Ligand binder design. Structure first.
Ligand SMILES: NC(=O)C1=CN([C@@H]2O[C@H](COP(=O)(O)OP(=O)(O)OC[C@H]3O[C@@H](n4cnc5c(N)ncnc54)[C@H](O)[C@@H]3O)[C@@H](O)[C@H]2O)C=CC1
Ligand SMILES: NC(=O)C1=CN([C@@H]2O[C@H](COP(=O)(O)OP(=O)(O)OC[C@H]3O[C@@H](n4cnc5c(N)ncnc54)[C@H](O)[C@@H]3O)[C@@H](O)[C@H]2O)C=CC1
Ligand SMILES: NC(=O)C1=CN([C@@H]2O[C@H](COP(=O)(O)OP(=O)(O)OC[C@H]3O[C@@H](n4cnc5c(N)ncnc54)[C@H](O)[C@@H]3O)[C@@H](O)[C@H]2O)C=CC1
Ligand SMILES: NC(=O)C1=CN([C@@H]2O[C@H](COP(=O)(O)OP(=O)(O)OC[C@H]3O[C@@H](n4cnc5c(N)ncnc54)[C@H](O)[C@@H]3O)[C@@H](O)[C@H]2O)C=CC1
Ligand SMILES: NC(=O)C1=CN([C@@H]2O[C@H](COP(=O)(O)OP(=O)(O)OC[C@H]3O[C@@H](n4cnc5c(N)ncnc54)[C@H](O)[C@@H]3O)[C@@H](O)[C@H]2O)C=CC1
Ligand SMILES: NC(=O)C1=CN([C@@H]2O[C@H](COP(=O)(O)OP(=O)(O)OC[C@H]3O[C@@H](n4cnc5c(N)ncnc54)[C@H](O)[C@@H]3O)[C@@H](O)[C@H]2O)C=CC1
Ligand SMILES: Nc1nc2c(ncn2[C@@H]2O[C@H](COP(=O)(O)OP(=O)(O)OP(=O)(O)O)[C@@H](O)[C@H]2O)c(=O)[nH]1
Ligand SMILES: Nc1nc2c(ncn2[C@@H]2O[C@H](COP(=O)(O)OP(=O)(O)OP(=O)(O)O)[C@@H](O)[C@H]2O)c(=O)[nH]1
Ligand SMILES: Nc1nc2c(ncn2[C@@H]2O[C@H](COP(=O)(O)OP(=O)(O)OP(=O)(O)O)[C@@H](O)[C@H]2O)c(=O)[nH]1
Ligand SMILES: N[C@@H](CCC(=O)O)C(=O)O
Ligand SMILES: N[C@@H](CCC(=O)O)C(=O)O
Ligand SMILES: N[C@@H](CCC(=O)O)C(=O)O
Lengths: 501, 501, 501
C-alpha cells in the first residue's frame, strides 16, 4: 500500500461511477420520455443512480476452524453483493489479509459494471477470506473454503440462481472444486443445477475449457482491439500491431502468466515480470514457458537464469505496455508520473487510482480500464455457468451434422457446377480448406469459449470506442466504460417499478 | 455521545466478556476432565472463548424505498447474528441514526449473554435501520420495515427457526406487526410457524400478554431481588424494601414508562424523567399515569404541570435508584463521579461504559447489569415465541379442569373431615381463599407471563448472587453475570465437536 | 441360470473393473503430478479406485400393493446408486424375479462405466422390482410402478437432479409414462424440470425421438465401427462390411427387435431369434417386420411360418454375429466353447461371464463389450434428459434460419460466379443436392438423436480401439473399455478433494 494516494477502495470506484453518472445523466433524462417531463426525469434518474452505487448486501463471517495442530482459529470472511438487477450475482473469492469489507464492497461493485460492460447478465458480487493462504496447510485451506461455502450458502450468498462465486487472488480451480462439492453434497443436494453455483471449476467438475486462461486471453483481445486502431495509436505515437511491442506484467498469477503467454505468442515481447517479492528483467525478451517452468519448480520468479533480478519498481520498467495483474491501488499519485510506458492494460481489479488516471490522461498514456479488459474472466465463467445449466458438453448433439450438412452443402456446389459443365468440363472437386476442415463439424467447447470471448471483447470494445468518440473522452476509456455500464444497469431499474412497493 | 469516554461499543462488551473469561477460565479448565489434561484444557478453553466473542454473521443492507414525495432514498440497515449455539437467534430491531455495524455487533453479542443469563435458548442477534424515524411518515416507515424484512428474510436473517427479531429503540408493536405480515404473506407462506418469526407482536397478531411492559416489569423484579437482600443493602447503606426509595429514569420509552409504572406501584417515588429533549423534576413524586397522559397528548414530557423542567443532567439527579432506559454509553468516565445515587438499574442496553463501572465499584454504587435486568424483554418474547409454536392461547385446554379438579380436591379434604367428625361435629366447608378463587382454574396467559418472568428474574438473580459470592465480586454484578453467561454458552460448544469438521 | 459358472453379478463386474484397474494404475500414478511423488501416488490411486468399485447407496423396498382381487401383496424392490461423481444418477428399472440386490448392485455399477464409455455425465444406477410382470394385470402393474416411484422419490432415489430412471427388462414407455406422471403430479409438483426425472418416456410425455430403438441402433453402430476395421477382421478371418454376414439374437425385446431391424437393413441377415420359451431358425434369413407382426399378433416367436423351431441353444447357432439381448450371465465356462460364431455383440447387460471371456479370447472370438455397445440406450436417454431441460422440441427456433441462411449462402456462391462470368457465361444455378434438401433447414430432433448417437458410438469406439492398441489388449475390448471408464471416472475424484472432509 502507498500512503500519499491510498484512497478508500469502494469510494474510489464510486468516484469512477459518479463521473460516468454525470456524463450520461443528460442522455438518461433524454430518452426517458415519461409524462413527468421536467427535471423530475433528472431526479428519477439521480435517484436510481443513488440506488445503484451502494452495495445491496454485505455478509460478514467470523467462523471457527480447528487448524492442523489441533488448535482453534477464527476466520474472518466477507461477501458483498453489489447489485441484483441481474440474478444471480457473480464475482470471485479472494484470499488475502488485505481483505476488508471496503475492498470486497469495492470489487463487488466492479463486478456489477464489469458484467454490464461485456453484457453478462449477472449482478456484481465478491468475497474475501482474510487469511494469508501461504500460512495454512492444504488440509486447512480445504476445511476453510468448505466451511466458508456453508456459511455463505446458509445466509443465501451462494446459489446457482442467487450468487455464483469464482476464483480470484490466491484461489483457483482447487478452491472452486471444493465450493461445488460442499454445496452439491449438502444444501444443494436436490438442486439439479447445483454444480452451477460456482465457476472456475476444474474441467472434470463441470468447468469450461480455457477458463483459467480466459481472463488473460481476454486481456490479449482487449489490448488488441485498441492497439490495432491507429486513431488511438496516432494519439500515443505508436505503431499499430503487436509485432514490435514490449510489455511488462506486475504479478504472475492466473491473469499475469496468461496475459504474458497470449501476447508473447501473438507478437510482443515480455521485458519484466513482477511478483510480491521482486521483479525480473531482460530487454531481449522472457519466454513464458521457461519462466513458468521455473516458478513451478522453485516457487519464485526471482533468480531466473535468462533474466536479471530488477531492482526498482516493476511498474516503472521501460516498455510499451504495462499490465498490472496484481492487487489494486498500485499506480498512484506518486509513482504514476514515472511510468515510462504508453499503454496500461489493467488486468487486475482497479490497480490504478483516480489520481493516477489524471496523470495518465495528461501524459497521453492510454489506460485500458479494468471494467473492459479483465471481463474475460466473468465472460468465460458466464459460459461455464450456461454449460452447467445446459448439462451438455457443447457441440456434442450436432457435430456429425453441421459436419455432414456442410459436406452435403459442398456436394451441392459441386454437383451443380458439374451439372452445368457436363461430363466434359471435368469433375470439379469442392473441398474444405485446411482452415475449414478444423471447423467442418462446427462448434466445440474449445472454440465457443474462444470466439464467444473474442466476440464480446471486440463488440464491447467498440461499444466503448463509440462512447469515447461520442462524449469525446479520448483516452479516458475508463469513464467511457462506466458510461456504458451505468446506462445498461439503469435500463433495468427504469423499466421495472424499481422496487416492490 | 461523550468524548472522553466513548469506547467502541462491540469492544466495550468484549471488555465485559474478557473479564468474565478469566474469572471462570480456571473453573472451565477444571470441570473439563478430558483425556488431554494439560493446558490444552486451557487452550481448548481459550479457543472456544475466542470463538464465542466475535459475531458469527453480519448482514449490511443498502435497499431503496420510494419516499412519500415520489423520490427515491437508500436505507442503510444491519443485522448481526452474534452466536448460534442456540438457534434461533433472538434480538431486536433498532431505528436510529446512531445505528452502526459496531453498535449492532455489540447489542447482538449482549443478546447472546442476556439470553444465557435468563436461560432463554436463543443465540444473540440485533439489527438497526439507520433512520431517524420521526423524519418519515408512517406509510414510509411501513414500506421501510416491510422491505427490510424481505431483504433480511431472503439472506436468512429472519425466520422462526433461524432468527426472531423483536422491538427496540423507536420500534414497537406496529413494526413487529408488519414484520410478521410480510414474512407470513410472502416467504413464509407455507410456514405453519410463520408468525413465530418475530416477537413483540400485537396481541391480535400472535403476541403474548404483557410483552410491552415485560421488559419494565422485569426491571422491577431485578431491582427487587437485590434491594431485598440486606447483604447488599448493608453495603450501600440503604434500607431493605421499596417503601421509601426515590428513583429517576432517563428515557420514557417501553423500558422507561413501564419501569416507572412498576416501581411507583410496588413502592418507591419517581423524582425525575429524562428524554432526548430534557428532563422533568419533582422531589415530591411524579405519577406515571399523569405523565404518560401528558406525553400522549403533547408528545413531550417537558412542561409537565406537576413537575418543572430540570436544569442539568438527569443521570445526576439526587435519588436512590438510577434507571437509564435510553441509548447506550450514557454514564462515562466523566459524569460517573457525579451520579448522586446508589443503585444503577441498567434498563437500556449497555448504558454504562467500563470506566464508569470502575468509578461505581470504588464509590460503592451497585450497578445491576444490563444482562440480567432487561432480560425481561427477551424472556417474555421467548414466551411469545413458544405461544406461536404451541398455537394455543395458554391455559385454554385445562381451565375447567384444574378448576373442577381443585374443587374436587377441596371436596376431598371436606368429606374426609366430615367422614371423621360425624354429624355432631358439624359440616366443614372447605372453600378457596379470595386469592385462590382467582387461580382456581389455573394458569391463564396473563399469569404465566408474570410468574414465568417473575420466576427467572428470581432464579437468575440467585445464580448471579451465588457467583458474586463465590468468586467474591461483591457489587461487581456485571462480571458476575458474564461469568454465568460465558459458562452456559461454553457448555454447548464444549460438548459438541465445536464445528462440523 | 447356469450351474458351473454362475458367479456373483456384482463381483463379476468388479472382476472386469479390477482388470482395468491394474492396466491403467501405472498411468494413473504417472500423470498424477503431485508433490507426494512416491508409490503413495499409487496408494491414493488405490484408494480412489477402492472408493469407485462399491455402490454408494442401495435402497431396499417392501411396499404393499393391493392386487385386483382385493387382496394384499408385498412387493420387493431395490435401487442401487453406484457412483455420484456425476449427478444425476442414471439407469433403468428392471421387472423380473431374477431381481436381487446383487444383480441391481451389478447393473448400477455397469451404468457408471457405461456412461463413462460414451461420455454421458451421469453416475450409474439401476433398479429392480421383484415381480414376474406377466402375472399382474396392467392395472396392478400401474399401481406397482406408481407406488415404487413414490417410495423411491421420498428416499431420494429419483429426481431430475438426483437420479433419472429409464426402461429395461419388462419395462418400457408405459412404465416410464407412469413414473413421470406420479412425480410430476406429486412430489415434483413445483419442479419445472419434473418430467426430466425419467427417460424412455413416450414422445407425447416428453420423450425423445428414436429412444425405443436407440439402444438397438447403437448396437448397429457398435458392430459397424469394428466390422469395418479389417485390422480386427484380419484377426477374425472375416470380411470387412455387413453385406455378407449372418447373425443371431437371443431375446426379441427392445434391444433384440431393433438390433435385428438395424442390421437386416444395413446389410446382414438374421438366422435365428431366441426368447424365454425357445428359438426359431432359418438360414435363408428372417424378416424382422414379419416376425414382429407375428409376435404382436400371437405373443410368441415360436411357430413362425417362415422359420422352423430351432433344436438347441440359440447362443450356439452357427452364424457370424451373436447378439445376446436377454438377461445376463448367458455365455459361461460351459457353453462358451461351443459358440460357433465370430463376433459377440453384447446387447444385454453382462450376458457373458469372465470365464466365457477367457475362452472367447483364446478362440479368437471378438466380444464387443456391454459397456460400449448398448450405451446407445443411455446416450439417447441423455438426449431425452437435455430435451426436458431445454423445454424445446429440438430444431424449432432455427429451422427457417439455417434454411434461409443456407439458401442465401448458396445464393452467394452463385452471384459471385455470375459476377465474374458476366452475361457471357450464362446463369449458374447453385442448388442443394437431394441429400442436402433434406438437411436444408438443419437439425430436427430425429436427426440429432441419430447423428448425436452415431457420433459417440463412433467417437467412443475409437477411444476403445486406441486403448486396445495402446495397452495391446487385441480383442480384449472389454478390458479396453473399463480402462477408459476407470480413467474418466477417476479424473473427477482426483481433482476434487475426493470427499467432504
Ligand atoms: N482468476 C480469474 O479468473 C480473475 C482474476 N482477476 C483479477 O487479477 C488480479 C490477480 O490475479 P489472480 O487471478 O488472482 O492470480 P494470483 O492470485 O495467483 O496472483 C497473485 C501472484 O502475483 C504476486 N503478487 C500479488 N500481488 C502482488 C503485488 N501487489 N505486487 C507484486 N506482485 C504481486 C504474488 O506473489 C502472487 O504469487 C486481481 O485483481 C483479480 O481480481 C480478474 C479477472 C479474472
Ligand atoms: N458432478 C456433476 O454433475 C458435474 C457437472 N458436469 C456437467 O457435465 C456436463 C457434460 O460435459 P462433461 O461431462 O463436463 O465432459 P467434457 O467433454 O466437457 O470434458 C470433461 C472431461 O471429463 C471427461 N469425461 C467425459 N465423461 C465423463 C464422465 N461421465 N465422468 C467423468 N469424466 C468424464 C471428458 O472425456 C473430459 O476429459 C457439463 O455440462 C457439466 O455441467 C461435469 C462435471 C461434474
Ligand atoms: N422494547 C423492549 O422490549 C426492550 C428494549 N431495551 C432497551 O430500552 C432502551 C430504550 O427504550 P425502548 O423501549 O427500547 O425504545 P423507546 O424509543 O420507546 O425509548 C427510548 C426513549 O428514550 C429517549 N432517548 C433516546 N435516546 C436518548 C438519549 N441519549 N438521551 C435522552 N433520551 C433519549 C427517546 O426519545 C425515547 O423516548 C434501549 O436500550 C433498548 O434496547 C431493552 C430490553 C427490552
Ligand atoms: N393471524 C393471527 O392472529 C395468528 C396467531 N396464531 C395463534 O393464535 C393463537 C390464539 O391466541 P389467542 O386465542 O388470540 O389468545 P387469548 O389468550 O387472548 O384467547 C382468549 C381471548 O382472546 C380473544 N381471541 C381469541 N381468539 C381470537 C381470534 N382468532 N381473533 C380475535 N380474538 C381472539 C378472545 O376475545 C378471547 O376472549 C396464538 O396462540 C397463535 O399461536 C397463529 C397463526 C396466525
Ligand atoms: N431398453 C434399454 O434401454 C436397453 C436395455 N439393455 C439390456 O438388454 C437386455 C434386454 O432388455 P430390453 O431389450 O431393454 O427389454 P425387454 O425386456 O423387452 O427384452 C427381453 C427379451 O429377452 C427375453 N428373455 C428373457 N430371458 C431370456 C432368456 N434366458 N433367454 C432368452 N431370452 C430371454 C425376453 O422374453 C424378451 O424376449 C437387458 O439385459 C437390458 O439390461 C441394455 C442397454 C439399453
Ligand atoms: N411435458 C413435458 O415433458 C415437459 C418438457 N417440455 C419440453 O417442451 C417440448 C414439447 O414439445 P413436443 O410436444 O414434445 O414436440 P412436437 O410439437 O413436435 O410434437 C411431438 C409429439 O407431441 C404431440 N404433439 C404434437 N403437437 C403437439 C402440441 N401442440 N401440443 C401437445 N402435443 C403435441 C404429439 O403426440 C407428437 O407426437 C419438449 O422439449 C419437452 O421436453 C416442456 C414442459 C414440460
Ligand atoms: N500452466 C500452463 N497452462 C497452460 C499452458 N499452455 C496452455 N495452458 C492452459 O491449459 C489449457 C489446455 O490448453 P491447450 O490444450 O493447448 O488448448 P488451447 O485452446 O490451444 O489453449 P491456449 O493455447 O492456451 O489458448 C488451456 O485452457 C490453457 O489455458 C502452459 O504452458 N502452462
Ligand atoms: N399501558 C398501561 N397498561 C395497563 C395499565 N394498567 C393495566 N394495564 C394492562 O391491563 C391489564 C390489567 O391491569 P391490572 O388490573 O392492574 O392487573 P396487572 O396485570 O397486575 O397490572 P400491571 O402489571 O400493572 O399491568 C394489565 O395486565 C396490563 O396489561 C396502565 O396503567 N398502563
Ligand atoms: N416396431 C417397429 N417400429 C418401426 C418400424 N419401422 C419404423 N419404426 C419406427 O420408426 C422410427 C424411426 O423411423 P423413421 O422416421 O422412418 O426413420 P428412417 O430413417 O426412415 O428409418 P428407421 O429409423 O430405420 O425407421 C423407429 O424408432 C420406430 O419407432 C418397424 O418395422 N417396427
Ligand atoms: N474474480 C474475477 C472473475 C469473476 C468471475 O468469473 O465470476 C473477476 O473479478 O473478474
Ligand atoms: N430488544 C430487546 C428485546 C429483544 C427480544 O425480546 O428479542 C433486548 O435487546 O433485550
Ligand atoms: N436400462 C438401459 C438404459 C439406461 C438409461 O437409458 O438410463 C441401460 O442400462 O443401458
Amino acid at each position: 500500500a502507498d500512503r500519499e494516494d491510498d484512497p478508500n477502495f469502494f469510494k474510489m470506484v464510486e468516484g469512477f461511477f459518479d463521473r460516468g453518472a454525470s456524463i450520461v445523466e443528460d442522455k438518461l433524462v433524454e430518452d426517458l420520455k415519461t409524462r413527468e417531463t421536467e427535471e423530475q426525469k433528472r431526479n428519477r434518474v439521480r435517484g436510481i443512480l443513488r440506488i445503484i452505487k451502494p452495495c445491496n448486501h454485505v455478509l460478514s463471517l467470523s467462523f471457527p476452524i480447528r487448524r492442523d495442530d489441533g488448535s482453534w482459529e477464527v476466520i474472518e470472511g466477507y461477501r458483498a453483493q453489489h447489485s441484483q438487477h441481474r440474478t444471480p450475482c457473480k464475482g470471485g473469492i479472494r484470499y488475502s489479509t488485505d481483505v476488508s469489507v471496503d475492498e470486497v464492497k469495492a470489487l463487488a461493485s466492479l463486478m456489477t459494471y464489469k458484467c454490464a460492460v461485456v453484457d453478462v447478465p449477472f449482478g456484481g458480487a465478491k468475497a474475501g477470506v482474510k487469511i494469508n493462504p501461504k500460512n495454512y496447510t492444504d488440509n486447512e485451506l480445504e476445511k476453510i473454503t468448505r466451511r466458508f461455502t456453508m456459511e455463505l450458502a446458509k445466509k443465501g450468498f451462494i446459489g446457482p440462481g442467487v450468487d455464483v462465486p469464482a476464483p480470484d487472488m490466491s484461489t483457483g480451480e482447487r478452491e472452486m472444486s471444493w465450493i461445488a462439492d460442499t454445496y452439491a453434497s449438502t444444501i444443494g443436494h436436490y438442486d439439479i443445477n447445483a454444480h452451477a453455483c460456482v465457476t472456475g471449476k476444474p474441467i472434470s467438475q463441470g468447468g469450461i475449457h480455457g477458463r483459467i486462461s480466459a481472463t488473460g486471453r481476454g486481456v490479449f483481445h482487449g489490448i488488441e482491439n485498441f492497439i490495432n486502431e491507429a486513431s488511438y495509436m496516432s494519439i500515443l505515437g505508436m505503431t499499430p500491431g503487436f509485432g514490435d511491442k514490449t510489455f511488462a506484467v506486475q504479478g504472475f498469477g492466473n491473469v499475469g502468466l496468461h496475459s504474458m503467454r497470449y501476447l508473447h505468442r501473438f507478437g510482443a515481447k515480455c521485458v519484466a515480470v513482477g511478483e510480491s517479492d521482486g521483479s525480473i528483467w531482460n530487454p531481449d525478451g522472457i519466454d513464458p514457458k521457461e519462466l513458468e517452468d521455473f516458478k513451478l519448480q522453485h516457487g519464485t520468479i526471482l533468480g531466473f537464469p535468462k533474466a536479471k533480478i530488477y531492482e526498482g519498481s516493476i511498474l516503472e520498467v521501460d516498455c510499451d505496455i504495462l499490465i498490472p495483474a496484481a492487487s489494486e491501488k498500485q499506480l498512484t499519485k506518486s509513482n504514476a508520473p514515472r511510468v515510462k510506458a504508453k499503454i496500461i492494460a489493467e488486468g487486475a481489479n482497479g490497480p490504478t487510482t483516480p489520481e493516477a488516471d489524471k496523470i495518465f490522461l495528461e501524459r497521453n498514456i492510454m489506460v485500458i480500464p479494468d471494467l473492459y479488459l479483465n471481463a474475460g474472466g466473468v465472460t468465460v465463467s458466464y459460459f461455464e455457468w450456461l454449460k452447467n445449466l445446459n448439462h451438455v458438453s457443447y457441440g456434442r448433439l450436432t457435430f456429425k451434422y453441421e459436419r455432414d450438412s456442410n459436406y452435403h452443402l459442398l456436394m451441392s456446389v459441386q454437383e451443380s457446377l458439374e451439372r452445368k459443365f457436363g461430363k466434359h468440363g471435368g469433375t470439379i472437386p469442392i473441398v474444405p480448406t485446411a482452415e475449414f476442415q478444423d471447423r467442418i463439424s462446427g462448434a466445440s467447447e474449445k472454440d465457443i469459449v474462444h470466439s464467444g470471448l473474442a466476440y464480446t471483447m471486440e463488440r464491447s470494445a467498440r461499444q466503448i470506442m463509440r462512447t469515447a468518440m461520442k462524449y469525446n473522452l479520448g483516452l479516458d476509456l475508463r469513464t467511457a466504460a462506466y458510461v456504458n455500464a451505468i446506462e445498461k444497469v439503469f435500463r433495468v431499474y427504469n423499466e421495472a417499478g424499481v422496487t416492490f412497493t
